[PDB]
Amino acid sequence: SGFRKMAFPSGKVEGCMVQVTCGTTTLNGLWLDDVVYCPRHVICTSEDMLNPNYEDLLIRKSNHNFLVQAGNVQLRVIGHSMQNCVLKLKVDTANPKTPKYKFVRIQPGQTFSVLACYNGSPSGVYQCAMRPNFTIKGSFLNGSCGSVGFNIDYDCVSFCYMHHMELPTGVHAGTDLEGNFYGPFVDRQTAQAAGTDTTITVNVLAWLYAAVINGDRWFLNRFTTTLNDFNLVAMKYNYEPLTQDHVDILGPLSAQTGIAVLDMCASLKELLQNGMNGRTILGSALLEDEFTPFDVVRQCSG
Amino acid sequence: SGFRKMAFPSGKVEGCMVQVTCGTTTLNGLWLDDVVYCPRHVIPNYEDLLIRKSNHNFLVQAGNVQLRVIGHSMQNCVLKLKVDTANPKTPKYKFVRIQPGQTFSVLACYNGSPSGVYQCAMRPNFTIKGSFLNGSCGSVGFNIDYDCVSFCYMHHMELPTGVHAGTDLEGNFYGPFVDRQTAQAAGTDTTITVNVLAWLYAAVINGDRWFLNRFTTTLNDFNLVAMKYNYEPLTQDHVDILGPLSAQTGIAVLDMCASLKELLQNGMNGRTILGSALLEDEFTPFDVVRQCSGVTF
Numbered sequence: 001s002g003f004r005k006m007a008f009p010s011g012k013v014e015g016c017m018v019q020v021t022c023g024t025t026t027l028n029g030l031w032l033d034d035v036v037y038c039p040r041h042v043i044c045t046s047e048d049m050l051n052p053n054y055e056d057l058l059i060r061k062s063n064h065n066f067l068v069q070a071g072n073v074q075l076r077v078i079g080h081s082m083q084n085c086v087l088k089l090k091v092d093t094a095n096p097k098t099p100k101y102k103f104v105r106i107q108p109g110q111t112f113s114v115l116a117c118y119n120g121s122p123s124g125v126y127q128c129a130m131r132p133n134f135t136i137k138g139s140f141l142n143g144s145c146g147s148v149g150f151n152i153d154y155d156c157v158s159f160c161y162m163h164h165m166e167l168p169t170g171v172h173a174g175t176d177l178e179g180n181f182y183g184p185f186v187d188r189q190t191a192q193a194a195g196t197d198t199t200i201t202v203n204v205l206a207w208l209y210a211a212v213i214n215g216d217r218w219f220l221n222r223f224t225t226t227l228n229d230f231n232l233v234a235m236k237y238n239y240e241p242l243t244q245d246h247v248d249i250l251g252p253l254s255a256q257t258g259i260a261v262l263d264m265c266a267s268l269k270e271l272l273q274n275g276m277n278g279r280t281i282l283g284s285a286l287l288e289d290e291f292t293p294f295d296v297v298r299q300c301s302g
Numbered sequence: 303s304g305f306r307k308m309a310f311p312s313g314k315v316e317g318c319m320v321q322v323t324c325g326t327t328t329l330n331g332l333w334l335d336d337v338v339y340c341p342r343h344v345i346p347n348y349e350d351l352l353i354r355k356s357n358h359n360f361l362v363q364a365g366n367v368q369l370r371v372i373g374h375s376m377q378n379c380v381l382k383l384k385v386d387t388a389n390p391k392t393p394k395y396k397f398v399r400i401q402p403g404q405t406f407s408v409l410a411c412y413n414g415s416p417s418g419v420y421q422c423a424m425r426p427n428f429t430i431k432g433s434f435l436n437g438s439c440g441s442v443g444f445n446i447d448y449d450c451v452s453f454c455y456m457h458h459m460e461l462p463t464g465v466h467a468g469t470d471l472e473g474n475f476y477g478p479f480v481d482r483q484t485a486q487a488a489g490t491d492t493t494i495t496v497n498v499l500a501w502l503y504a505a506v507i508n509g510d511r512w513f514l515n516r517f518t519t520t521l522n523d524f525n526l527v528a529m530k531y532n533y534e535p536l537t538q539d540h541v542d543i544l545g546p547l548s549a550q551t552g553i554a555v556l557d558m559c560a561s562l563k564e565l566l567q568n569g570m571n572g573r574t575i576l577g578s579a580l581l582e583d584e585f586t587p588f589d590v591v592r593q594c595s596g597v598t599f
């Protein structure tokens with residue numbers, strides 16, 4: 001019993017964090033095999049941040065301009081290439097702590113753990129979700145660039161995120177490990193605003209099923225709804241549309257609890273209308289949306 | 303910017319998790335140097351049940367390697383299995399007993415394999431509101447100070463309300479609990495006041511000021527109100543501990559107490575603080591400073 005926002009154990013990722021210094025800029029790199037991955041904005045100066053030409057700035061750099069530090073060991077950069085918004089520094093040593101890994105690009109609503117780092121040293125680990133507006137509500141200070149988001153399903157680390165920047169609202173933007181940004185963001189100081197954020201509906205339903213599995217049933221009702229009627233109500237509360245894929249995904253939880261997805265949708269509609277009334281669901285007074293259906297099953301069953 | 307419930311990086315602890323099997327029971331062990339620590343309920347008159355056990359009855363597995371048990375002893379509610387091999391991944395460590403209100407990270411394990419890491423607090427009623435399934439016994443709570451892991455908790459059981467009970471690494475239970483199937487109930491819980499204030503300072507540091515007011519209060523008047531809402535008494539030590547946050551934000555601790563007093567008597571009014579509609583009490587003043595300054599390990 002119990003339901004916590006749980007991150008993956010960060011050990012496999014900690015053994016990959018390095019510090020990447022280029023000129024006056026220092027941030028984090030991810031050392032996997034003989035390559036160090038980091039945000040390409042590490043090659044940027046003061047006046048080369050509003051409109052940087054990364055191809056032009058990178059051509060002027062030599063291998064010895066990049067200082068990579070793994071613990072108290074300086075690694076030797078023997079090559080450099082750019083892939084989208086990520087810089088790949090070929091090094092003369094393969095990381096002995098390289099875990100079994102994959103680069104995966106996630107979709108909004110997906111969760112992952114973040115290993116926040118400063119100067120190549122891990123400071124903390126927390127659980128996040130890719131918001132529908134493609135930002136992450138992380139916890140990052142200056143120097144956190146290069147910190148990574150990942151999932152550890154089985155013994156394989158799936159890297160899904162690399163931190164690049166903080167938007168004016170305090171939310172964060174970044175890329176997959178191939179350098180493709182999540183959302184309409186670019187790695188420059190130009191005016192960029194996150195779109196209006198919405199609640200990840202399928203995740204709220206997954207969390208309502210977690211509450212039922214843990215013995216919380218007060219919010220259940222005798223009603224059901226059509227998928228269309230639910231979405232018409234949901235949109236009015238800035239909730240993401242629930243698709244037939246989401247209904248299918250929630251099938252296992254519906255089978256385990258005996259509460260049909262559209263039946264749980266009618267509970268969610270009622271909660272949106274009434275609020276909680278001094279009550280909590282799994283120790284929360286708000287509807288939690290950073291637990292996917294897969295997270296709920298893993299945490300409640302194994 | 304941002305404020306998250308953040309756990310310590312769990313790597314140093316992951317290299318210590320092993321699986322301990324005794325008879326039909328399988329749980330987790332903590333392998334430090336040549337000793338494996340685990341809950342004694344893996345084997346009631348525990349002295350008598352332990353005397354009937356031989357070293358080969360304990361099957362300890364570190365990854366795909368079976369470790370050989372060369373000795374066994376009991377210290378309070380923890381079993382210590384002496385093994386032939388010292389753990390090469392043994393970090394710099396200490397066994398520390400924490401006080402209610404203090405926070406720590408939990409590395410939840412099943413069959414000696416880490417499955418997740420979360421942050422939690424020792425409740426004033428000595429329970430932890432964890433996330434644990436069958437097989438999680440032996441999972442440990444810890445903090446990291448510089449490069450030293452301070453082990454503070456070992457999971458033993460789940461109480462009927464779904465909350466959890468366990469011991470320090472010397473086998474002394476936190477709270478009035480015993481390691482036996484019997485009627486045991488967690489006492490009435492209270493809110494960790496100093497932690498709520500620390501979290502209000504974290505909200506101010508992140509730009510949330512709506513709850514601030516022009517008012518201040520005496521420590522005595524605050525505690526009279528706090529006692530009424532099942533909040534822990536705020537001591538002069540807590541006020542001193544909150545000093546650095548008070549200096550950084552410009553909001554005196556008793557000034558923040560007047561904000562808390564109003565929040566208790568009047569509620570949030572549809573508003574949130576750091577994305578929460580409840581007052582968060584599982585961040586200590588040190589946690590807030592560590593996260594709002596970026597201390598690394």
Ligand SMILES: O=C(Nc1cncc2ccccc12)[C@@H]1NCCc2ccc(Cl)cc21
Pocket residue numbers: 041049140141142143144145164165166186187188189303
């Ligand atoms: O956002 C960046 N860094 C940070 C990242 N996270 C939390 C921060 C908090 C406080 C200050 C900086 C933070 C990075 N340096 C600032 C300008 C900038 C502009 C464009 C790009 Cl691509 C990156 C950057």
Ligand SMILES: [Cl-]
Pocket residue numbers: 105106107110
């Ligand atoms: Cl995905």
